[PDB]
Short mmCIF file of C-alpha atoms (C1' of nucleotides) and ligand atoms in Angstrom, two decimals:
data_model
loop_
_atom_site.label_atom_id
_atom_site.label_comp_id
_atom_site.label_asym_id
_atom_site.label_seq_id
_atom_site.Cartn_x
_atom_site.Cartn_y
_atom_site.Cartn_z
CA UNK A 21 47.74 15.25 104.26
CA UNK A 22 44.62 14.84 105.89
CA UNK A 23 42.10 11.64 105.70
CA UNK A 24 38.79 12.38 105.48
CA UNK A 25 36.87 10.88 108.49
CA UNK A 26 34.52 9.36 105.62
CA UNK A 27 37.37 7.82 103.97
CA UNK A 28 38.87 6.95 107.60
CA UNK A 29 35.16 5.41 109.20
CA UNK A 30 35.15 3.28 105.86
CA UNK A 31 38.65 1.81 106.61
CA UNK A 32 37.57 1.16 110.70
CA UNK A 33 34.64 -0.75 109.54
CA UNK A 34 36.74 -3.35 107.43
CA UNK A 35 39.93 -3.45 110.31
CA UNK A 36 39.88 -6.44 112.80
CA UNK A 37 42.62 -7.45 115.41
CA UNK A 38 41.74 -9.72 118.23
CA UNK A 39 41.71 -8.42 121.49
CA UNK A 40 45.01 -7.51 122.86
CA UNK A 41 45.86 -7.39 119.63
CA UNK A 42 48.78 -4.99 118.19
CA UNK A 43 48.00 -2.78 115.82
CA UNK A 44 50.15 -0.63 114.00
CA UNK A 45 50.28 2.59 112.39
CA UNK A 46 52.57 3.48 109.93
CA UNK A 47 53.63 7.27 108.68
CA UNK A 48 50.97 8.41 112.08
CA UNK A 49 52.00 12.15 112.39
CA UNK A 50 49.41 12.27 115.12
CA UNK A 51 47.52 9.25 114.85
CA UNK A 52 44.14 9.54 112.98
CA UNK A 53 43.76 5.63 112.38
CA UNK A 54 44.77 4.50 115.91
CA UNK A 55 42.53 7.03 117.67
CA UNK A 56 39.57 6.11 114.89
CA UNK A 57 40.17 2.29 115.88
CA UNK A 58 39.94 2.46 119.62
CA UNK A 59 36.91 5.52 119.09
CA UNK A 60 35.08 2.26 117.37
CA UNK A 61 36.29 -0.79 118.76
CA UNK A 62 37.57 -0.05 122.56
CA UNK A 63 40.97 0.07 124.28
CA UNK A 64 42.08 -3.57 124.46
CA UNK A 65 44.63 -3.63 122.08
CA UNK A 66 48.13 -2.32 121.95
CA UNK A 67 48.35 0.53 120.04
CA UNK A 68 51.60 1.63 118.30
CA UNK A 69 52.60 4.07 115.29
CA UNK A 70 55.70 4.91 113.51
CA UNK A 71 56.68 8.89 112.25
CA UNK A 72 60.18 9.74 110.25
CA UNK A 73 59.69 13.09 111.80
CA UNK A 74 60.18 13.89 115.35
CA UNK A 75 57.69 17.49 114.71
CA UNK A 76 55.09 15.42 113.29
CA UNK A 77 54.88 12.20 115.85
CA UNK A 78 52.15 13.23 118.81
CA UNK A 79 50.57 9.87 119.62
CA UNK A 80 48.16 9.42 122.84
CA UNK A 81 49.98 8.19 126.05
CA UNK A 82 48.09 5.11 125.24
CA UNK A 83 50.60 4.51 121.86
CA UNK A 84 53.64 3.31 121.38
CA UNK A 85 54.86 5.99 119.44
CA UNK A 86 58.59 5.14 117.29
CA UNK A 87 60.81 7.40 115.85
CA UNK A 88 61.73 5.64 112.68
CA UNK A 89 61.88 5.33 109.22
CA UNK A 90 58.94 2.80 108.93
CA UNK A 91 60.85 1.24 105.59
CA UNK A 92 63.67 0.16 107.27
CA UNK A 93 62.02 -0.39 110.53
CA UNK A 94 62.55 -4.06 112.54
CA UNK A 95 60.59 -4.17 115.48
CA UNK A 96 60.10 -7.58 117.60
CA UNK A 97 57.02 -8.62 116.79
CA UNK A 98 55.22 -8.72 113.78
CA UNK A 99 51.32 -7.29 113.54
CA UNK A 100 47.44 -8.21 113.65
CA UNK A 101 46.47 -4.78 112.33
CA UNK A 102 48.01 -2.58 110.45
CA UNK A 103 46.21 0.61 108.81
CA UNK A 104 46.26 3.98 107.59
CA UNK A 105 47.51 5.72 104.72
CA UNK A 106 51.43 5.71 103.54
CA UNK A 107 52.71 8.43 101.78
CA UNK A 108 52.66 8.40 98.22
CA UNK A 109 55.19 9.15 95.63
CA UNK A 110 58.64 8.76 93.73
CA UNK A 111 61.81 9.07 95.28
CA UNK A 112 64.10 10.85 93.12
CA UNK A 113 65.90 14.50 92.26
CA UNK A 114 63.52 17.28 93.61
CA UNK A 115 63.33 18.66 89.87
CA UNK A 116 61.09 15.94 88.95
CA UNK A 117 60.05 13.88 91.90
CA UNK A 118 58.33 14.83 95.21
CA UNK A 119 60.08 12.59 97.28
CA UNK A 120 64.02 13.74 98.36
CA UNK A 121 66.30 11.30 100.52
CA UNK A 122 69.96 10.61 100.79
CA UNK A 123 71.11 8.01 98.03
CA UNK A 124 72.02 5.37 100.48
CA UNK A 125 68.43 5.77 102.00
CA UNK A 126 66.85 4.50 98.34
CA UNK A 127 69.72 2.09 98.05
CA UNK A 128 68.35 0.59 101.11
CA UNK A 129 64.85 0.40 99.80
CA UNK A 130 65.73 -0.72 97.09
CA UNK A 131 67.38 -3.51 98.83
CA UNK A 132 64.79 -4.30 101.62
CA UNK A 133 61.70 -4.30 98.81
CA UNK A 134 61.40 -7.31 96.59
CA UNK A 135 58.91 -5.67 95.02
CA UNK A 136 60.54 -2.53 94.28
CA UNK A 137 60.65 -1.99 90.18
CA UNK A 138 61.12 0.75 87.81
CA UNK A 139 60.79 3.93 89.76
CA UNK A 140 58.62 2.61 92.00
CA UNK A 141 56.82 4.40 94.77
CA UNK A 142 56.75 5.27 98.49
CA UNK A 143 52.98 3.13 98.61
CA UNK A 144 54.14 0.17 96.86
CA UNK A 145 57.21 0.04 100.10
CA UNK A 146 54.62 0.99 102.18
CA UNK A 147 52.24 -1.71 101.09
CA UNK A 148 55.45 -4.58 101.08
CA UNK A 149 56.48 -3.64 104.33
CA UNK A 150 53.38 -3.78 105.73
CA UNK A 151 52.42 -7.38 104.60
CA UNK A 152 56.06 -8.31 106.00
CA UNK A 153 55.35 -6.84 109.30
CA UNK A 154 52.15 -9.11 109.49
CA UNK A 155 51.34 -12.45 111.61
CA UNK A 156 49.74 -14.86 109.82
CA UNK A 157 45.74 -14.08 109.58
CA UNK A 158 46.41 -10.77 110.41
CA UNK A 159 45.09 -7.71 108.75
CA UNK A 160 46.30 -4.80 106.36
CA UNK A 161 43.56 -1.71 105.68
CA UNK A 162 45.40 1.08 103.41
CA UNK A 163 43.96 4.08 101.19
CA UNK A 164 46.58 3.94 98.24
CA UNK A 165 46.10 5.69 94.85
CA UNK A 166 44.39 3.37 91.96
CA UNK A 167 47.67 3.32 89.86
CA UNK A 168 49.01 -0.51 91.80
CA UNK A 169 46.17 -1.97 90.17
CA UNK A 170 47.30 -1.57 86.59
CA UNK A 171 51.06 -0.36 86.00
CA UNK A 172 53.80 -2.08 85.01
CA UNK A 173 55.54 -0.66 88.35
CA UNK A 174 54.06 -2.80 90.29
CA UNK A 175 53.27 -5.92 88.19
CA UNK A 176 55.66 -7.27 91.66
CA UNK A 177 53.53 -5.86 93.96
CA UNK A 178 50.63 -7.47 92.57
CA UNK A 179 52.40 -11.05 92.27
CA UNK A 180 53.53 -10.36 95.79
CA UNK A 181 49.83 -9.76 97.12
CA UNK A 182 48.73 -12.47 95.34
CA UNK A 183 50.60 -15.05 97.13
CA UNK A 184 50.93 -13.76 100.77
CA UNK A 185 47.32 -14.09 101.30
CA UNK A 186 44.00 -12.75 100.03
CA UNK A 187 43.47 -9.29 98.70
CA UNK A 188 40.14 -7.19 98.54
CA UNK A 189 40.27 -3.88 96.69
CA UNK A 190 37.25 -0.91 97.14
CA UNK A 191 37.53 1.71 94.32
CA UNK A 192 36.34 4.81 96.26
CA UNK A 193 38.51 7.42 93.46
CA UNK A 194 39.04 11.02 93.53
CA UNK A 195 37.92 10.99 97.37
CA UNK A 196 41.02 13.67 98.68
CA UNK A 197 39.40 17.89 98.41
CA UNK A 198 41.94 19.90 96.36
CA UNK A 199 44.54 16.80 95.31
CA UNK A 200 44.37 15.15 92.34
CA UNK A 201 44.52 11.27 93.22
CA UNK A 202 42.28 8.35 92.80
CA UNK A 203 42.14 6.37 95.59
CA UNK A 204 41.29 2.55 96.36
CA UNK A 205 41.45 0.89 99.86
CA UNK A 206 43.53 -2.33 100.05
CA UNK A 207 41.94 -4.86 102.90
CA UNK A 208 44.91 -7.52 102.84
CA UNK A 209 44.75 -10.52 104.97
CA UNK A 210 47.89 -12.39 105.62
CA UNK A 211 46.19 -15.86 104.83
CA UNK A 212 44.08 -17.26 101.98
CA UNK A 213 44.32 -16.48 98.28
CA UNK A 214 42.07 -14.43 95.60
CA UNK A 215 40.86 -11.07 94.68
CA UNK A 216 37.90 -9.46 95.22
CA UNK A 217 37.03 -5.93 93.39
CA UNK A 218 34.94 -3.59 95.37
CA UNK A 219 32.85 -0.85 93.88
CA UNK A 220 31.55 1.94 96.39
CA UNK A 221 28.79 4.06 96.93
CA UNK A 222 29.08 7.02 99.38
CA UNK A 223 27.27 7.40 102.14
CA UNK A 224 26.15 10.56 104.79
CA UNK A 225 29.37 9.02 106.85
CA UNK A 226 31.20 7.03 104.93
CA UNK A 227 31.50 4.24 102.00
CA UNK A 228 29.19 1.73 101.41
CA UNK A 229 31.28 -1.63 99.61
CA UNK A 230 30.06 -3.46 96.35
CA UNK A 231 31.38 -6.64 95.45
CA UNK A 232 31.59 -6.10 91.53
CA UNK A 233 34.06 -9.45 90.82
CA UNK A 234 36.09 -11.93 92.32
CA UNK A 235 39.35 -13.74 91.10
CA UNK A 236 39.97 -16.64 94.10
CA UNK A 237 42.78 -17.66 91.58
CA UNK A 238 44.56 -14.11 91.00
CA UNK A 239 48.22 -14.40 91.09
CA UNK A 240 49.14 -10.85 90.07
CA UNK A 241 46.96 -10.00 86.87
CA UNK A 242 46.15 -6.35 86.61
CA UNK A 243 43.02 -5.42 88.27
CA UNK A 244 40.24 -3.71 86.05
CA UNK A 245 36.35 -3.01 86.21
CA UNK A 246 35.36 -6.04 83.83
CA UNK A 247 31.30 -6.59 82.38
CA UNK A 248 30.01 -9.06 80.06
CA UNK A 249 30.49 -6.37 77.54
CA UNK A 250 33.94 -5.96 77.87
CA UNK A 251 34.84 -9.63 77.64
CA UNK A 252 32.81 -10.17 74.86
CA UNK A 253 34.41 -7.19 73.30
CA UNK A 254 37.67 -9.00 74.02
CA UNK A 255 37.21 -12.52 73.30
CA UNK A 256 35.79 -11.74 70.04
CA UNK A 257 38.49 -9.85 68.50
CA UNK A 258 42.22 -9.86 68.38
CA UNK A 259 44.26 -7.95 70.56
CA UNK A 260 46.38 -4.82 69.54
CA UNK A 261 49.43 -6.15 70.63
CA UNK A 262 49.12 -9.38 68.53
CA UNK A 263 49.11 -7.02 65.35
CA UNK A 264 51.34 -4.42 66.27
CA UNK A 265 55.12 -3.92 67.76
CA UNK A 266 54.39 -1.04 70.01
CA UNK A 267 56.59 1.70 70.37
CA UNK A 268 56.96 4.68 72.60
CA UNK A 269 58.15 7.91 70.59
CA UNK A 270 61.68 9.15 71.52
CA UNK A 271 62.18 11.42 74.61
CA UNK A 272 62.66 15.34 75.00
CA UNK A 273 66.59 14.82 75.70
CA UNK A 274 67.25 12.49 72.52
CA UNK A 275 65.76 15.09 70.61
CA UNK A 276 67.96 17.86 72.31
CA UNK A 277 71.05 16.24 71.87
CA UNK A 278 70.51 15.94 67.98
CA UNK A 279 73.20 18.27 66.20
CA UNK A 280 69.90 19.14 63.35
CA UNK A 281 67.26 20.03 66.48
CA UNK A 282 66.44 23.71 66.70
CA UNK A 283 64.17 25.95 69.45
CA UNK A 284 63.31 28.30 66.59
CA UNK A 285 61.14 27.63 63.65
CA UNK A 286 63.05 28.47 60.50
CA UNK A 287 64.49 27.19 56.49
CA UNK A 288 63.27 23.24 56.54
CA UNK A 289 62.17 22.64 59.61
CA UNK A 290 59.53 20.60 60.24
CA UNK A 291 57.69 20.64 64.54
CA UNK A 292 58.79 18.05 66.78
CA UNK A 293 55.00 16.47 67.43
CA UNK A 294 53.29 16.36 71.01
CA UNK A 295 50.50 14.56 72.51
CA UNK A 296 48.63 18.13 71.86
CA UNK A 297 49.51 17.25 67.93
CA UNK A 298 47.52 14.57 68.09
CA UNK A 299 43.54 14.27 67.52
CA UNK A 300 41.00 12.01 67.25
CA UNK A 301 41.53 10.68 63.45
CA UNK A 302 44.28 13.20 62.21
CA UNK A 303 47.46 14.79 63.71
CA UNK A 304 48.23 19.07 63.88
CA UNK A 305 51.24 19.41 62.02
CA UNK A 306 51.33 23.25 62.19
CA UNK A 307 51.13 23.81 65.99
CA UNK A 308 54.59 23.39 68.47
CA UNK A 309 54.12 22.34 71.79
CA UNK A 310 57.46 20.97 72.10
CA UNK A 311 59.52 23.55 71.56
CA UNK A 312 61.92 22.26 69.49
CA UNK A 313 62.24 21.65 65.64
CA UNK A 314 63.89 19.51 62.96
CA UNK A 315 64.50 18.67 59.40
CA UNK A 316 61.54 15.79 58.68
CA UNK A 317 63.94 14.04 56.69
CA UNK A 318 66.27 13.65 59.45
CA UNK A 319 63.39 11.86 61.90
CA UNK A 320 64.84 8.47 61.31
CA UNK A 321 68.00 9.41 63.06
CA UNK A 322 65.93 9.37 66.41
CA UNK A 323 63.37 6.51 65.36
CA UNK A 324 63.58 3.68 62.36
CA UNK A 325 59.74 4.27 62.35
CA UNK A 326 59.62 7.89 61.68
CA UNK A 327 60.45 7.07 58.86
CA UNK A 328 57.00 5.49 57.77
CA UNK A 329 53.24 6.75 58.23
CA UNK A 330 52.47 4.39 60.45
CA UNK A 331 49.60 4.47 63.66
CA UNK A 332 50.04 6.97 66.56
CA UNK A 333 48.07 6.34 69.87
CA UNK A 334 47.91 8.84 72.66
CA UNK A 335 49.35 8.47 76.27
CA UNK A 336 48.18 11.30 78.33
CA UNK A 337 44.42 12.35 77.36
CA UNK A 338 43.21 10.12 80.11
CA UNK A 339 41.64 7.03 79.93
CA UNK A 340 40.61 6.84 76.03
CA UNK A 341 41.67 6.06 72.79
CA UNK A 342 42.40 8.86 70.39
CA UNK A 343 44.40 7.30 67.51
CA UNK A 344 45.38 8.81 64.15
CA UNK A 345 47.70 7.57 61.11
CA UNK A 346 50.38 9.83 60.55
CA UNK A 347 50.62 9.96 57.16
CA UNK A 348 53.53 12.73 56.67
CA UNK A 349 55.87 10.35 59.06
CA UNK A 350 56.66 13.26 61.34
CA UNK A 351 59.42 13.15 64.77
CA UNK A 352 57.38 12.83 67.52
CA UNK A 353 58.12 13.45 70.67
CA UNK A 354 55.44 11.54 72.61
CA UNK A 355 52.72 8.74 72.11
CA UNK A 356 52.58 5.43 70.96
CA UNK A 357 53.92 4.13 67.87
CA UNK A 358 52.61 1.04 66.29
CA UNK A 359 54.02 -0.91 63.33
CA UNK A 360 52.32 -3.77 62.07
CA UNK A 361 54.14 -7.18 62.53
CA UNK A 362 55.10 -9.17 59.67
CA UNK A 363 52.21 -10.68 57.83
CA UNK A 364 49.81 -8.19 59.16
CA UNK A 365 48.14 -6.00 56.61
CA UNK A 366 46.33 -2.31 57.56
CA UNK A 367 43.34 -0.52 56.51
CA UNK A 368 44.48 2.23 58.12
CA UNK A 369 41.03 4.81 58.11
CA UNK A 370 38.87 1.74 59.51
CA UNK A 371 41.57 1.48 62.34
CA UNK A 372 41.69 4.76 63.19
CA UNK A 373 37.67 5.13 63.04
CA UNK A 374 37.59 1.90 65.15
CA UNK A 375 40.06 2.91 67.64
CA UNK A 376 38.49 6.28 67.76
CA UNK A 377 34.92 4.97 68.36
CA UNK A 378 32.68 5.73 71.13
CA UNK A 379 32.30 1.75 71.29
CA UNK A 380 35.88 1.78 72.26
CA UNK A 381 35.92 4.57 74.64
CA UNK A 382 33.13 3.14 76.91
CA UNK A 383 35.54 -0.06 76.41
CA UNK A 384 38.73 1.51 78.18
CA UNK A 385 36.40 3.44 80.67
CA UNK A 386 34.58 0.94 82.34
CA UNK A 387 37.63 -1.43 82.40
CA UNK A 388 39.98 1.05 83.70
CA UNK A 389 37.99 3.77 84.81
CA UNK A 390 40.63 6.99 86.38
CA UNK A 391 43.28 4.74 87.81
CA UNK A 392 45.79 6.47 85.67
CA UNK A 393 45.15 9.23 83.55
CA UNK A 394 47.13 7.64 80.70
CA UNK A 395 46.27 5.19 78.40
CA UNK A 396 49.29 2.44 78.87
CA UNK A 397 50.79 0.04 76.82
CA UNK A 398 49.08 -2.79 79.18
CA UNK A 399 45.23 -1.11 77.86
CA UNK A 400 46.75 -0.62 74.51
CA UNK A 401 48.09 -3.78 73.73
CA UNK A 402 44.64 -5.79 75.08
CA UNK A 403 42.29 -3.29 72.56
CA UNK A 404 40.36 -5.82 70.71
CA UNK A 405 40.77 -5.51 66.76
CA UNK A 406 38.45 -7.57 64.02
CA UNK A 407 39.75 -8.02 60.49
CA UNK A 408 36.77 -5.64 59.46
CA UNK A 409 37.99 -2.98 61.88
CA UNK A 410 41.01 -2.70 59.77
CA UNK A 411 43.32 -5.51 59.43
CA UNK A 412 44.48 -8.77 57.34
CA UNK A 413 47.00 -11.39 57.38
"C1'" DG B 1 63.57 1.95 75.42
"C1'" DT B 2 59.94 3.86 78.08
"C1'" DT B 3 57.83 4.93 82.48
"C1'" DC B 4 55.33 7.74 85.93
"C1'" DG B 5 52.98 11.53 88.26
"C1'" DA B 6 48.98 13.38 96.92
"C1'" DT B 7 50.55 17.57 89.54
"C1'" DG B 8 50.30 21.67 86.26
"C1'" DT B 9 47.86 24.51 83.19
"C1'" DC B 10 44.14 26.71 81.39
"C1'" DG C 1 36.73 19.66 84.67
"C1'" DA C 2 39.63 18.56 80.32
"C1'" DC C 3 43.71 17.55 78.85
"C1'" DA C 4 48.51 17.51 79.12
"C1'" DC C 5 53.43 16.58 80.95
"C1'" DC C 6 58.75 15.58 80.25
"C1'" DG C 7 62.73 13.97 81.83
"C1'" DA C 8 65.00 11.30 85.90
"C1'" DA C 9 64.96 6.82 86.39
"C1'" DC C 10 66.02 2.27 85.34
N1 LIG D 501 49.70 9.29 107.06
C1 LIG D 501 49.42 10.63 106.48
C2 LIG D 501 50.19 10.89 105.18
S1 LIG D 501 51.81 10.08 105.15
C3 LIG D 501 52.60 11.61 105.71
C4 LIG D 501 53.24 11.44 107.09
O1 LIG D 501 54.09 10.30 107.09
C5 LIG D 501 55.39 10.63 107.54
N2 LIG D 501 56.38 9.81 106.81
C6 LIG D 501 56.84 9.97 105.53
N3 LIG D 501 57.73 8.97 105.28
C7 LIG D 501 57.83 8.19 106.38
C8 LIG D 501 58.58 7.05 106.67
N4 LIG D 501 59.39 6.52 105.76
N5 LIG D 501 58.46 6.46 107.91
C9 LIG D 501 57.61 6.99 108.86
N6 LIG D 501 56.87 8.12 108.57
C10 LIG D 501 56.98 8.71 107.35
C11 LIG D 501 55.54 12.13 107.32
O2 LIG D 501 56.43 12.68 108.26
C12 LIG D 501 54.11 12.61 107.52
O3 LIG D 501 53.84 12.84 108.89
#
DNA sequence: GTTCGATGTC
DNA sequence: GACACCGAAC
């Protein structure tokens, strides 16, 4: 991978480290970030960097340059300045997941990181270990994907952030030619507290920084693109998730394992629904994306809830909010399911015409922007919902 | 019980 | 440039 010097100049401009300062970085292959930061700010610091892989690592003879896992790297001294950008993705089995190492490796990880959750990824490690390899004051400057500032994966990372010093985020998104990523840069300093969201607006050379909110009392929230409109919108209405027990459909090997599940269409089976079998206010019942079939009747087996039409909302159209009320009470194999908690009442076709609006679609965008190209249960279950728009108790 | 994607597909 | 994983992982 390959910074762009826009991306890179943007990142120089917000690093500091006092004079004779160390700075560190991490993942360096050749050094981009250390050669950037003495291009810009002179040669009076000690510069050092840290590459897994012995082909890759071709520092200056002014660097330190370490052959080392930086993850389970403990040098002597901690840092004033650490930049650049980590690698990003998920460790696990190279079917699936990018990122391949030797069991006890992850195990490792998984026991240095207290902020390692879920699946995790390489960033979030990246991110930790940085802010652990810090003095106090000093300063963190990364380019990390958007995905930190909203998902559930690193609801520690956040928390962790939040009270090892003060945190400014710059959205710059899809910013990397030919790679599909959007992209924010973390400035972390290891003293303080608070968030402050950065827009950005490119430049000839680089990024210039917006301040579009600030939270000096964040302890971990997720992070989203907020306006007068949206909180109104919010504080107004009810949320989703007040309403609703949201579910997530059962996945592809539940439905394999089922002795009724077939791959051919045939005598009383019904298609095993997709997020490409649902639309904005109805659901394709004809279509098969999944590949596999079932008796209808037999749905419940997988789900309770398949048992009753009940609200589907979609997962992976990107950021929006295409919901439709499955009124046949199909299996699904993707997408949200809600059911409405005890003592709430549904108009379902308001719902789904309120859910579907254009209203609500500027909603999720502005909040949430391309972070993710989901919609998650954290956006879902924070959709604002008046009694008119579909519900009673 | 459900998450996540330096991506894949068209 | 729109719209989707799908199953390993916890
Ligand atoms: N900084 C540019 C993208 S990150 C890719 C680079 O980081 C290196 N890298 C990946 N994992 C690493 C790790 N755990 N410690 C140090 N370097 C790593 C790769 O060898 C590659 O040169």
């Amino acid at each position: 991978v390959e910074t762009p010097p826009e991306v890179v100049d943007f990142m120089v401009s917000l690093a500091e480290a006092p004079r004779g300062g160390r700075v560190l970085e991490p993942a360096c292959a050749h050094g981009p970030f250390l050669r950037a930061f003495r291009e810009a700010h002179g040669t009076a610091y000690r510069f050092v960097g840290v590459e897994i892989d012995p082909k890759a690592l071709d520092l200056p003879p002014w660097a330190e340059g370490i052959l080392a896992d930086f993850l389970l790297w403990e040098p002597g001294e901690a840092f004033d300045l650490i930049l650049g950008n980590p690698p990003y993705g998920i460790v696990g089995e190279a079917s699936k997941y990018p990122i391949h190492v030797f069991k006890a490796v992850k195990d490792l990880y998984k026991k240095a990181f207290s902020t390692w959750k879920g699946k995790y990824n390489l960033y979030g490690a990246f991110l930790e270990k940085a802010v652990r390899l810090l003095k106090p004051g000093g300063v963190l400057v990364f380019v990390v994907p958007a995905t930190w500032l909203v998902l559930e994966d690193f609801a520690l990372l956040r928390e962790f952030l939040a009270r090892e010093g003060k945190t400014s985020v710059y959205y710059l998104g899809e910013v990397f030619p030919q790679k599909k990523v959007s992209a924010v840069v973390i400035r972390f300093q290891k003293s303080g507290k608070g968030l402050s969201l950065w827009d950005t607006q490119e430049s000839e050379s680089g990024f210039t920084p917006i301040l579009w909110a600030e939270y000096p009392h964040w302890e971990g929230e997720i992070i989203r693109f907020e306006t007068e409109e949206t909180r109104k919108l919010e504080i107004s209405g009810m949320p989703l998730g007040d309403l609703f027990h949201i579910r997530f459909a059962a996945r592809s090997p539940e439905f394999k394992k089922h002795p009724a599940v077939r791959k051919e269409p045939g005598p009383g089976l019904v298609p095993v629904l997709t997020g490409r079998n649902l639309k904005p206010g109805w659901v394709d019942y004809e279509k098969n994306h999944s590949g596999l079939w079932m008796p209808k009747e037999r749905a419940k087996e997988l789900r309770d809830f398949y048992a009753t039409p009940h609200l589907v909302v979609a997962h992976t159209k990107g950021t929006r909010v295409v919901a439709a009320w499955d009124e046949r009470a199909y299996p699904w194999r993707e997408e949200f399911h809600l059911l409405p908690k005890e003592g709430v009442r549904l108009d379902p076709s308001s719902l789904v015409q309120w859910l579907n609006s254009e209203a609500m679609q500027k909603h999720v965008r502005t909040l949430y922007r391309d972070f993710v190209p989901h919609l998650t249960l954290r956006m879902l279950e924070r959709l604002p919902v008046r009694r008119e728009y579909g519900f009673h108790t």
